[PDB]
mmCIF file of C-alpha atoms and ligand atoms in Angstrom:
data_model
loop_
_atom_site.group_PDB
_atom_site.id
_atom_site.type_symbol
_atom_site.label_atom_id
_atom_site.label_comp_id
_atom_site.label_asym_id
_atom_site.label_seq_id
_atom_site.Cartn_x
_atom_site.Cartn_y
_atom_site.Cartn_z
ATOM 1 C CA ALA A 1 18.034 0.797 -16.022
ATOM 2 C CA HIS A 2 15.118 -1.116 -14.623
ATOM 3 C CA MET A 3 11.377 -1.670 -15.593
ATOM 4 C CA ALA A 4 8.657 -3.399 -13.579
ATOM 5 C CA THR A 5 6.255 -5.659 -15.309
ATOM 6 C CA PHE A 6 2.739 -3.758 -15.919
ATOM 7 C CA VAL A 7 -0.200 -5.032 -14.289
ATOM 8 C CA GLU A 8 -3.325 -3.945 -16.099
ATOM 9 C CA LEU A 9 -6.316 -2.623 -13.874
ATOM 10 C CA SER A 10 -9.919 -2.958 -14.859
ATOM 11 C CA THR A 11 -9.602 0.649 -16.169
ATOM 12 C CA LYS A 12 -6.885 -0.665 -18.400
ATOM 13 C CA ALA A 13 -4.300 1.772 -16.890
ATOM 14 C CA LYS A 14 -0.992 0.109 -16.344
ATOM 15 C CA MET A 15 0.284 -0.459 -12.804
ATOM 16 C CA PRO A 16 3.752 -1.156 -12.207
ATOM 17 C CA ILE A 17 4.027 -4.535 -10.327
ATOM 18 C CA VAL A 18 6.881 -3.044 -8.021
ATOM 19 C CA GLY A 19 6.490 0.196 -6.369
ATOM 20 C CA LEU A 20 8.497 2.318 -3.880
ATOM 21 C CA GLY A 21 6.672 2.499 -0.340
ATOM 22 C CA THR A 22 7.031 5.704 1.603
ATOM 23 C CA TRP A 23 6.808 4.795 5.325
ATOM 24 C CA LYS A 24 7.705 7.766 7.659
ATOM 25 C CA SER A 25 11.503 8.766 7.400
ATOM 26 C CA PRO A 26 13.239 11.956 8.550
ATOM 27 C CA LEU A 27 14.023 14.211 6.976
ATOM 28 C CA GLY A 28 14.782 14.512 3.337
ATOM 29 C CA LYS A 29 15.566 10.802 3.560
ATOM 30 C CA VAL A 30 12.289 10.002 1.577
ATOM 31 C CA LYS A 31 12.892 12.749 -0.967
ATOM 32 C CA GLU A 32 16.447 11.242 -1.994
ATOM 33 C CA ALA A 33 14.682 7.787 -1.916
ATOM 34 C CA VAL A 34 12.277 8.915 -4.485
ATOM 35 C CA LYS A 35 14.862 10.525 -6.504
ATOM 36 C CA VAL A 36 17.044 7.424 -6.370
ATOM 37 C CA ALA A 37 13.996 5.204 -7.228
ATOM 38 C CA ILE A 38 13.188 7.274 -10.357
ATOM 39 C CA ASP A 39 16.792 7.167 -11.405
ATOM 40 C CA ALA A 40 16.815 3.306 -10.989
ATOM 41 C CA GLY A 41 13.698 2.872 -12.963
ATOM 42 C CA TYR A 42 10.634 3.011 -10.541
ATOM 43 C CA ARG A 43 7.710 4.717 -11.743
ATOM 44 C CA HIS A 44 5.169 3.416 -9.149
ATOM 45 C CA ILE A 45 5.263 5.353 -5.659
ATOM 46 C CA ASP A 46 3.040 4.511 -2.887
ATOM 47 C CA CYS A 47 2.219 7.690 -0.581
ATOM 48 C CA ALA A 48 0.017 8.479 2.430
ATOM 49 C CA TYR A 49 -1.516 11.547 4.005
ATOM 50 C CA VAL A 50 -0.979 9.931 7.357
ATOM 51 C CA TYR A 51 3.007 9.813 6.987
ATOM 52 C CA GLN A 52 3.010 13.657 6.922
ATOM 53 C CA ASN A 53 5.924 13.322 4.714
ATOM 54 C CA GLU A 54 4.162 13.763 1.315
ATOM 55 C CA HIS A 55 5.830 17.190 0.597
ATOM 56 C CA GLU A 56 9.331 15.651 0.425
ATOM 57 C CA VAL A 57 8.074 13.093 -2.272
ATOM 58 C CA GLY A 58 6.572 16.104 -3.921
ATOM 59 C CA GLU A 59 10.063 18.041 -4.003
ATOM 60 C CA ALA A 60 11.604 14.771 -5.431
ATOM 61 C CA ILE A 61 9.073 14.124 -8.304
ATOM 62 C CA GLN A 62 9.056 17.762 -9.159
ATOM 63 C CA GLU A 63 12.964 18.146 -9.235
ATOM 64 C CA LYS A 64 13.208 14.880 -11.540
ATOM 65 C CA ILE A 65 10.462 16.303 -13.851
ATOM 66 C CA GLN A 66 12.479 19.524 -14.389
ATOM 67 C CA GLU A 67 15.614 17.445 -14.690
ATOM 68 C CA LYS A 68 13.955 15.634 -17.497
ATOM 69 C CA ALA A 69 14.578 12.287 -15.706
ATOM 70 C CA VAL A 70 10.895 11.364 -15.932
ATOM 71 C CA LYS A 71 7.535 12.355 -17.554
ATOM 72 C CA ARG A 72 4.655 12.647 -15.539
ATOM 73 C CA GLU A 73 2.445 10.099 -17.738
ATOM 74 C CA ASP A 74 5.140 7.509 -16.916
ATOM 75 C CA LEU A 75 4.913 7.895 -13.150
ATOM 76 C CA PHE A 76 2.322 6.029 -11.306
ATOM 77 C CA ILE A 77 1.505 7.966 -8.033
ATOM 78 C CA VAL A 78 -0.971 6.297 -5.355
ATOM 79 C CA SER A 79 -2.231 8.031 -2.096
ATOM 80 C CA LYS A 80 -4.725 7.370 0.222
ATOM 81 C CA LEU A 81 -7.755 9.106 2.298
ATOM 82 C CA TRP A 82 -7.091 8.743 5.973
ATOM 83 C CA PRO A 83 -10.373 7.580 8.185
ATOM 84 C CA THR A 84 -10.640 10.866 10.013
ATOM 85 C CA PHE A 85 -11.568 12.402 6.715
ATOM 86 C CA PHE A 86 -14.411 10.257 5.557
ATOM 87 C CA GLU A 87 -17.019 13.306 5.898
ATOM 88 C CA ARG A 88 -17.640 14.676 2.637
ATOM 89 C CA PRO A 89 -16.152 18.379 2.848
ATOM 90 C CA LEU A 90 -13.152 16.674 4.641
ATOM 91 C CA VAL A 91 -12.544 14.210 1.775
ATOM 92 C CA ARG A 92 -12.128 16.966 -0.626
ATOM 93 C CA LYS A 93 -9.805 18.929 1.890
ATOM 94 C CA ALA A 94 -7.658 15.922 2.765
ATOM 95 C CA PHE A 95 -7.248 15.163 -0.909
ATOM 96 C CA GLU A 96 -6.301 18.599 -1.781
ATOM 97 C CA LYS A 97 -3.666 18.729 0.974
ATOM 98 C CA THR A 98 -2.236 15.344 -0.600
ATOM 99 C CA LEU A 99 -2.292 16.676 -4.117
ATOM 100 C CA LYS A 100 -0.701 20.112 -2.857
ATOM 101 C CA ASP A 101 2.076 18.450 -1.039
ATOM 102 C CA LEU A 102 2.871 16.190 -4.042
ATOM 103 C CA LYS A 103 2.708 19.159 -6.414
ATOM 104 C CA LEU A 104 0.456 17.134 -8.701
ATOM 105 C CA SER A 105 -2.384 17.848 -10.865
ATOM 106 C CA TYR A 106 -3.921 14.310 -10.506
ATOM 107 C CA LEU A 107 -3.153 10.987 -8.849
ATOM 108 C CA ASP A 108 -3.158 7.631 -10.743
ATOM 109 C CA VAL A 109 -4.831 5.855 -7.775
ATOM 110 C CA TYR A 110 -6.457 7.298 -4.712
ATOM 111 C CA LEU A 111 -7.274 4.661 -1.955
ATOM 112 C CA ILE A 112 -9.478 4.415 1.126
ATOM 113 C CA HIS A 113 -6.703 3.664 3.574
ATOM 114 C CA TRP A 114 -8.704 2.014 6.164
ATOM 115 C CA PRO A 115 -12.487 0.994 6.240
ATOM 116 C CA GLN A 116 -13.519 2.288 9.651
ATOM 117 C CA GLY A 117 -14.423 5.932 9.849
ATOM 118 C CA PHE A 118 -12.616 7.854 12.625
ATOM 119 C CA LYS A 119 -13.721 10.900 14.764
ATOM 120 C CA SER A 120 -13.202 14.321 12.661
ATOM 121 C CA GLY A 121 -10.880 16.767 14.454
ATOM 122 C CA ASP A 122 -7.167 17.590 14.699
ATOM 123 C CA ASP A 123 -6.048 13.986 16.041
ATOM 124 C CA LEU A 124 -5.242 11.560 13.296
ATOM 125 C CA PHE A 125 -5.628 8.789 15.831
ATOM 126 C CA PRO A 126 -8.497 9.966 17.927
ATOM 127 C CA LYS A 127 -8.881 7.696 21.125
ATOM 128 C CA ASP A 128 -11.023 7.760 24.217
ATOM 129 C CA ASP A 129 -9.553 8.420 27.884
ATOM 130 C CA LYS A 130 -9.010 4.640 27.943
ATOM 131 C CA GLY A 131 -6.990 4.378 24.577
ATOM 132 C CA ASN A 132 -9.706 2.956 22.362
ATOM 133 C CA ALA A 133 -10.401 4.665 19.022
ATOM 134 C CA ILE A 134 -13.206 6.933 18.503
ATOM 135 C CA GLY A 135 -15.635 6.509 15.678
ATOM 136 C CA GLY A 136 -16.829 9.015 13.314
ATOM 137 C CA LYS A 137 -20.183 10.032 11.332
ATOM 138 C CA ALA A 138 -19.252 9.077 7.896
ATOM 139 C CA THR A 139 -18.619 5.709 6.473
ATOM 140 C CA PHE A 140 -16.230 4.237 3.939
ATOM 141 C CA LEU A 141 -19.327 4.260 1.543
ATOM 142 C CA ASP A 142 -19.915 7.946 2.230
ATOM 143 C CA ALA A 143 -16.156 8.646 1.580
ATOM 144 C CA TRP A 144 -16.328 6.740 -1.587
ATOM 145 C CA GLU A 145 -19.077 8.780 -3.088
ATOM 146 C CA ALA A 146 -16.994 11.930 -2.371
ATOM 147 C CA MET A 147 -13.949 10.216 -3.999
ATOM 148 C CA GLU A 148 -15.881 9.374 -7.010
ATOM 149 C CA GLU A 149 -16.469 13.036 -7.636
ATOM 150 C CA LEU A 150 -12.772 13.506 -7.830
ATOM 151 C CA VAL A 151 -12.633 10.993 -10.691
ATOM 152 C CA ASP A 152 -15.537 12.770 -12.327
ATOM 153 C CA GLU A 153 -13.464 15.959 -12.366
ATOM 154 C CA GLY A 154 -10.239 14.290 -13.635
ATOM 155 C CA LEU A 155 -8.467 14.853 -10.471
ATOM 156 C CA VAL A 156 -7.930 11.113 -9.721
ATOM 157 C CA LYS A 157 -7.781 8.482 -12.659
ATOM 158 C CA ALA A 158 -8.951 5.349 -10.636
ATOM 159 C CA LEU A 159 -9.953 4.530 -6.879
ATOM 160 C CA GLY A 160 -9.150 1.698 -4.615
ATOM 161 C CA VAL A 161 -9.362 0.349 -1.018
ATOM 162 C CA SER A 162 -6.878 -0.611 1.627
ATOM 163 C CA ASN A 163 -7.302 -3.245 4.470
ATOM 164 C CA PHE A 164 -10.590 -4.110 3.253
ATOM 165 C CA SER A 165 -12.023 -7.724 3.824
ATOM 166 C CA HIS A 166 -14.128 -9.329 0.927
ATOM 167 C CA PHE A 167 -17.126 -8.563 2.953
ATOM 168 C CA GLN A 168 -16.485 -4.813 2.808
ATOM 169 C CA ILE A 169 -15.415 -5.060 -0.832
ATOM 170 C CA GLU A 170 -18.893 -6.939 -1.257
ATOM 171 C CA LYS A 171 -20.475 -3.926 0.408
ATOM 172 C CA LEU A 172 -18.796 -1.438 -1.755
ATOM 173 C CA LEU A 173 -19.531 -3.531 -5.051
ATOM 174 C CA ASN A 174 -23.072 -3.615 -4.213
ATOM 175 C CA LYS A 175 -23.633 -0.024 -3.163
ATOM 176 C CA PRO A 176 -26.632 1.504 -4.949
ATOM 177 C CA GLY A 177 -25.639 4.216 -7.460
ATOM 178 C CA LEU A 178 -22.004 2.888 -7.652
ATOM 179 C CA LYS A 179 -19.991 4.812 -10.250
ATOM 180 C CA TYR A 180 -16.571 3.572 -10.010
ATOM 181 C CA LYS A 181 -15.082 0.148 -8.902
ATOM 182 C CA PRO A 182 -12.050 -0.192 -6.621
ATOM 183 C CA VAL A 183 -8.974 -1.137 -9.001
ATOM 184 C CA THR A 184 -6.892 -2.445 -6.225
ATOM 185 C CA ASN A 185 -7.098 -3.684 -2.496
ATOM 186 C CA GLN A 186 -3.668 -2.643 -0.828
ATOM 187 C CA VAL A 187 -3.281 -5.173 2.081
ATOM 188 C CA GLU A 188 -0.575 -6.749 4.090
ATOM 189 C CA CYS A 189 0.877 -9.753 2.318
ATOM 190 C CA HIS A 190 4.183 -11.754 2.787
ATOM 191 C CA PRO A 191 4.901 -15.390 3.540
ATOM 192 C CA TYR A 192 3.616 -15.254 7.138
ATOM 193 C CA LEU A 193 0.356 -13.855 5.729
ATOM 194 C CA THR A 194 -0.283 -15.175 2.298
ATOM 195 C CA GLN A 195 -3.858 -13.903 1.828
ATOM 196 C CA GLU A 196 -4.823 -16.870 -0.384
ATOM 197 C CA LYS A 197 -8.561 -16.580 0.000
ATOM 198 C CA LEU A 198 -8.592 -12.726 -0.243
ATOM 199 C CA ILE A 199 -6.374 -12.620 -3.300
ATOM 200 C CA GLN A 200 -8.515 -15.319 -4.870
ATOM 201 C CA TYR A 201 -11.584 -13.183 -4.097
ATOM 202 C CA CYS A 202 -10.180 -9.840 -5.532
ATOM 203 C CA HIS A 203 -8.826 -11.419 -8.675
ATOM 204 C CA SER A 204 -12.214 -13.182 -9.143
ATOM 205 C CA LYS A 205 -13.777 -9.699 -9.149
ATOM 206 C CA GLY A 206 -11.079 -7.893 -11.357
ATOM 207 C CA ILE A 207 -9.580 -6.176 -8.424
ATOM 208 C CA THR A 208 -5.773 -6.315 -8.168
ATOM 209 C CA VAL A 209 -4.052 -6.768 -4.811
ATOM 210 C CA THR A 210 -1.192 -4.612 -3.584
ATOM 211 C CA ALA A 211 0.937 -6.306 -1.044
ATOM 212 C CA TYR A 212 2.300 -3.893 1.737
ATOM 213 C CA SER A 213 5.045 -4.798 4.352
ATOM 214 C CA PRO A 214 6.358 -7.364 2.068
ATOM 215 C CA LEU A 215 9.664 -7.478 3.955
ATOM 216 C CA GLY A 216 7.827 -7.895 7.435
ATOM 217 C CA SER A 217 8.068 -3.889 8.196
ATOM 218 C CA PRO A 218 11.147 -4.513 10.484
ATOM 219 C CA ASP A 219 11.228 -0.817 11.253
ATOM 220 C CA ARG A 220 7.644 -0.767 12.712
ATOM 221 C CA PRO A 221 7.740 0.803 16.230
ATOM 222 C CA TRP A 222 5.864 -2.048 17.846
ATOM 223 C CA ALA A 223 7.916 -4.830 16.595
ATOM 224 C CA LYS A 224 8.958 -7.444 19.439
ATOM 225 C CA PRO A 225 12.223 -9.434 19.244
ATOM 226 C CA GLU A 226 9.834 -12.617 19.369
ATOM 227 C CA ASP A 227 7.713 -11.396 16.439
ATOM 228 C CA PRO A 228 8.691 -13.731 13.523
ATOM 229 C CA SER A 229 11.278 -12.252 11.309
ATOM 230 C CA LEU A 230 10.957 -12.644 7.436
ATOM 231 C CA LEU A 231 14.454 -11.071 6.349
ATOM 232 C CA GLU A 232 16.197 -13.409 8.861
ATOM 233 C CA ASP A 233 14.156 -16.399 8.000
ATOM 234 C CA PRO A 234 16.705 -19.067 7.215
ATOM 235 C CA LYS A 235 14.405 -20.954 4.891
ATOM 236 C CA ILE A 236 13.899 -17.795 2.954
ATOM 237 C CA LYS A 237 17.733 -17.083 2.892
ATOM 238 C CA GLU A 238 18.464 -20.468 1.704
ATOM 239 C CA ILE A 239 16.109 -19.997 -1.364
ATOM 240 C CA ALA A 240 17.751 -16.691 -2.061
ATOM 241 C CA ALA A 241 21.306 -17.960 -1.957
ATOM 242 C CA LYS A 242 20.156 -20.440 -4.568
ATOM 243 C CA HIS A 243 19.239 -17.709 -7.090
ATOM 244 C CA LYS A 244 22.291 -15.460 -6.030
ATOM 245 C CA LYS A 245 19.729 -12.982 -4.652
ATOM 246 C CA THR A 246 18.836 -11.390 -1.250
ATOM 247 C CA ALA A 247 16.001 -12.422 0.997
ATOM 248 C CA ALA A 248 14.618 -9.349 0.268
ATOM 249 C CA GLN A 249 14.493 -9.944 -3.270
ATOM 250 C CA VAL A 250 12.771 -13.476 -2.637
ATOM 251 C CA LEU A 251 10.253 -11.817 -0.639
ATOM 252 C CA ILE A 252 9.416 -9.210 -3.388
ATOM 253 C CA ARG A 253 9.575 -11.817 -6.130
ATOM 254 C CA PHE A 254 7.001 -14.038 -4.243
ATOM 255 C CA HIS A 255 4.256 -11.511 -4.890
ATOM 256 C CA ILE A 256 5.262 -10.856 -8.617
ATOM 257 C CA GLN A 257 4.721 -14.578 -9.277
ATOM 258 C CA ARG A 258 1.153 -14.425 -7.763
ATOM 259 C CA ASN A 259 0.463 -11.456 -10.085
ATOM 260 C CA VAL A 260 0.360 -9.350 -6.963
ATOM 261 C CA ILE A 261 1.640 -5.666 -6.970
ATOM 262 C CA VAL A 262 4.123 -5.097 -4.225
ATOM 263 C CA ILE A 263 5.501 -1.903 -2.725
ATOM 264 C CA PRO A 264 8.668 -2.480 -0.616
ATOM 265 C CA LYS A 265 9.886 0.581 1.379
ATOM 266 C CA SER A 266 13.452 1.764 1.491
ATOM 267 C CA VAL A 267 15.473 4.995 2.148
ATOM 268 C CA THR A 268 18.596 3.123 1.431
ATOM 269 C CA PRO A 269 19.834 3.665 -2.110
ATOM 270 C CA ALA A 270 21.511 0.301 -2.468
ATOM 271 C CA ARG A 271 18.501 -1.561 -1.349
ATOM 272 C CA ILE A 272 16.136 0.643 -3.582
ATOM 273 C CA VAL A 273 17.921 -0.705 -6.414
ATOM 274 C CA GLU A 274 18.332 -4.133 -5.312
ATOM 275 C CA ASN A 275 14.487 -4.171 -4.568
ATOM 276 C CA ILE A 276 13.731 -3.633 -8.319
ATOM 277 C CA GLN A 277 16.359 -6.131 -9.442
ATOM 278 C CA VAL A 278 13.760 -8.791 -9.322
ATOM 279 C CA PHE A 279 12.834 -9.402 -12.907
ATOM 280 C CA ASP A 280 16.027 -11.591 -13.830
ATOM 281 C CA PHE A 281 15.211 -14.635 -11.639
ATOM 282 C CA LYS A 282 12.283 -16.842 -10.958
ATOM 283 C CA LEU A 283 11.366 -18.964 -8.078
ATOM 284 C CA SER A 284 10.541 -22.698 -9.089
ATOM 285 C CA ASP A 285 6.868 -23.848 -8.670
ATOM 286 C CA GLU A 286 8.313 -25.903 -5.706
ATOM 287 C CA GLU A 287 10.042 -23.105 -4.144
ATOM 288 C CA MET A 288 6.472 -21.131 -4.488
ATOM 289 C CA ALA A 289 4.682 -23.881 -2.808
ATOM 290 C CA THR A 290 7.280 -23.879 0.004
ATOM 291 C CA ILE A 291 7.001 -20.115 0.682
ATOM 292 C CA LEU A 292 3.366 -20.262 0.402
ATOM 293 C CA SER A 293 3.334 -23.032 3.275
ATOM 294 C CA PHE A 294 4.891 -20.389 5.629
ATOM 295 C CA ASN A 295 1.617 -18.817 6.125
ATOM 296 C CA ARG A 296 1.054 -18.434 9.916
ATOM 297 C CA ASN A 297 -1.463 -15.625 9.580
ATOM 298 C CA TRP A 298 0.911 -13.144 11.205
ATOM 299 C CA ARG A 299 0.022 -9.434 10.883
ATOM 300 C CA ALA A 300 2.870 -7.005 11.367
ATOM 301 C CA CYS A 301 0.558 -4.100 10.773
ATOM 302 C CA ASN A 302 -2.219 -4.494 13.393
ATOM 303 C CA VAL A 303 -1.567 -1.467 15.512
ATOM 304 C CA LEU A 304 -4.963 0.373 15.259
ATOM 305 C CA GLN A 305 -6.862 -2.227 17.593
ATOM 306 C CA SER A 306 -10.249 -0.520 16.866
ATOM 307 C CA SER A 307 -11.859 -3.970 17.291
ATOM 308 C CA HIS A 308 -14.703 -2.434 19.099
ATOM 309 C CA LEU A 309 -15.751 -0.142 16.041
ATOM 310 C CA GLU A 310 -17.848 -1.069 13.182
ATOM 311 C CA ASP A 311 -16.314 -2.703 9.969
ATOM 312 C CA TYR A 312 -13.069 -3.835 11.821
ATOM 313 C CA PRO A 313 -11.428 -5.802 8.852
ATOM 314 C CA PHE A 314 -9.321 -8.426 10.384
ATOM 315 C CA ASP A 315 -12.130 -10.155 12.249
ATOM 316 C CA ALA A 316 -13.328 -11.475 8.881
ATOM 317 C CA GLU A 317 -11.662 -14.844 7.779
ATOM 318 C CA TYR A 318 -10.806 -12.913 4.610
HETATM 319 N N1 LIG B 1 -2.252 0.287 5.573
HETATM 320 C C1 LIG B 1 -1.520 0.461 4.643
HETATM 321 O O1 LIG B 1 -1.976 0.845 3.344
HETATM 322 C C2 LIG B 1 0.012 0.232 4.667
HETATM 323 C C3 LIG B 1 0.492 -0.271 5.788
HETATM 324 C C4 LIG B 1 1.982 -0.409 5.898
HETATM 325 C C5 LIG B 1 2.651 0.044 4.766
HETATM 326 N N2 LIG B 1 2.111 0.581 3.562
HETATM 327 C C6 LIG B 1 2.957 0.789 2.414
HETATM 328 O O2 LIG B 1 3.857 -0.231 2.218
HETATM 329 C C7 LIG B 1 5.390 0.268 2.200
HETATM 330 C C8 LIG B 1 6.180 -1.083 2.665
HETATM 331 O O3 LIG B 1 5.677 -1.439 3.810
HETATM 332 P P1 LIG B 1 6.503 -1.236 5.052
HETATM 333 O O4 LIG B 1 7.325 0.114 4.811
HETATM 334 O O5 LIG B 1 5.730 -1.246 6.289
HETATM 335 O O6 LIG B 1 7.545 -2.421 5.513
HETATM 336 P P2 LIG B 1 8.513 -3.190 4.172
HETATM 337 O O7 LIG B 1 8.723 -2.633 2.972
HETATM 338 O O8 LIG B 1 8.160 -4.732 4.368
HETATM 339 O O9 LIG B 1 9.920 -2.975 5.161
HETATM 340 C C9 LIG B 1 10.653 -1.877 5.143
HETATM 341 C C10 LIG B 1 11.854 -1.799 6.015
HETATM 342 O O10 LIG B 1 12.769 -2.803 5.436
HETATM 343 C C11 LIG B 1 14.133 -2.094 5.160
HETATM 344 N N3 LIG B 1 14.544 -2.579 3.802
HETATM 345 C C12 LIG B 1 14.084 -2.322 2.655
HETATM 346 N N4 LIG B 1 14.716 -2.861 1.732
HETATM 347 C C13 LIG B 1 15.533 -3.791 2.299
HETATM 348 C C14 LIG B 1 16.548 -4.969 1.641
HETATM 349 N N5 LIG B 1 16.678 -4.987 0.565
HETATM 350 N N6 LIG B 1 17.235 -5.501 2.541
HETATM 351 C C15 LIG B 1 17.067 -5.322 3.786
HETATM 352 N N7 LIG B 1 16.187 -4.396 4.529
HETATM 353 C C16 LIG B 1 15.399 -3.760 3.641
HETATM 354 C C17 LIG B 1 13.848 -0.640 5.193
HETATM 355 O O11 LIG B 1 15.141 -0.008 5.680
HETATM 356 P P3 LIG B 1 15.741 1.270 5.196
HETATM 357 O O12 LIG B 1 14.621 2.079 4.743
HETATM 358 O O13 LIG B 1 16.545 1.769 6.093
HETATM 359 O O14 LIG B 1 16.632 0.769 3.916
HETATM 360 C C18 LIG B 1 12.685 -0.458 6.098
HETATM 361 O O15 LIG B 1 13.054 -0.446 7.367
HETATM 362 C C19 LIG B 1 5.094 1.391 2.998
HETATM 363 O O16 LIG B 1 6.288 2.157 3.084
HETATM 364 C C20 LIG B 1 3.904 2.077 2.666
HETATM 365 O O17 LIG B 1 4.150 2.774 1.491
HETATM 366 C C21 LIG B 1 1.008 0.599 3.540
HETATM 367 O O1 LIG B 2 1.366 3.075 7.676
HETATM 368 C C1 LIG B 2 0.267 2.821 7.329
HETATM 369 O O2 LIG B 2 -0.209 2.578 6.047
HETATM 370 C C2 LIG B 2 -0.567 2.481 8.458
HETATM 371 C C3 LIG B 2 -1.898 1.917 8.145
HETATM 372 C C4 LIG B 2 -2.704 1.649 9.116
HETATM 373 C C5 LIG B 2 -2.486 1.827 10.347
HETATM 374 C C6 LIG B 2 -1.000 2.363 10.914
HETATM 375 C C7 LIG B 2 -0.170 2.609 9.681
HETATM 376 N N1 LIG B 2 1.054 3.103 9.960
HETATM 377 C C8 LIG B 2 1.470 4.229 10.444
HETATM 378 C C9 LIG B 2 0.742 5.386 11.007
HETATM 379 C C10 LIG B 2 1.370 6.471 11.517
HETATM 380 C C11 LIG B 2 2.580 6.470 11.612
HETATM 381 C C12 LIG B 2 3.545 5.576 11.265
HETATM 382 C C13 LIG B 2 4.997 5.736 11.248
HETATM 383 F F1 LIG B 2 5.409 6.872 11.452
HETATM 384 F F2 LIG B 2 5.561 5.053 12.400
HETATM 385 F F3 LIG B 2 5.570 5.232 10.189
HETATM 386 C C14 LIG B 2 2.861 4.302 10.693
#
């Protein structure tokens, strides 16, 4: 039985520092993973409309609630609003599909998944005849206002953002009539992309950071053989052996010691358990400085390439 440390949000809700990520996987693979996770002691599950797999997650949580394995109040469920749904009637409609598939009556956190609004319509990745993304009418600011209504109505406990730079967080924070603040910024983070200035910024504003792709997302479709490889990184493995731990566990523990929430994904039961076995060791302050020095500003997750649209987050330094 395991329990992740709590990270307290500006709303005083407690966010488990390790969560289970839910990257697309067939078919009931993700459902069992959620079941296995809950068994092992995970309470934080990270979800997304775009994965189109949220119903599996829903079946899993439902069954474990009836089985009496877990209660709702102890689960910490996060999902996100995809950019093609920023227009106000769409926000509510996308959210409702999320909350339905998940068979919940509320989310602990609802995130803006990406800062740039995309063309509304059937496509989730609207593109021109030349491949480039098509912008939409509503902004992330427009979306946020609709999302704040969800909080007003007790459908969501707290809001946050994902893939935001500090310039975009600044715009959100300085928005007139702002009701609710982002409790987290979920972004890619690992030793090749250490996000030092952004984490500094968020924390200075009382906004937590959630590290995604902490293992380098090896299963990403667009990987290349020469794309650097965190899990196979000899200097990571060496630090691991020193603690009698796996490379994956070191990569996870790295965020924990920076006070950064982290959501490693696995549909393999042995790995799910292993990925939460990370509160029995501690990297030395010298091991942490060594890992921090691996920063090469490499993004595994930069597929969108809507660098032509307004509010592209990765143009910013941080
Ligand atoms: N924009 C966003 O907000 C955003 C973007 C990307 C990801 N995310 C979230 O973050 C989560 C995690 O990121 P990710 O899925 O991109 O990549 P990740 O967690 O860095 O890596 C997942 C991959 O590593 C494998 N793996 C898991 N544990 C392992 C272990 N102990 N040893 C060796 N291999 C292991 C998994 O394989 P098996 O599953 O086959 O075990 C899977 O292929 C996602 O599921 C999603 O929830 C959010
Ligand atoms: O997975 C995210 O959170 C994500 C975020 C921004 C851009 C792309 C993203 N990934 C994504 C989007 C659609 C389908 C799949 C895949 F099925 F490959 F997992 C992965």
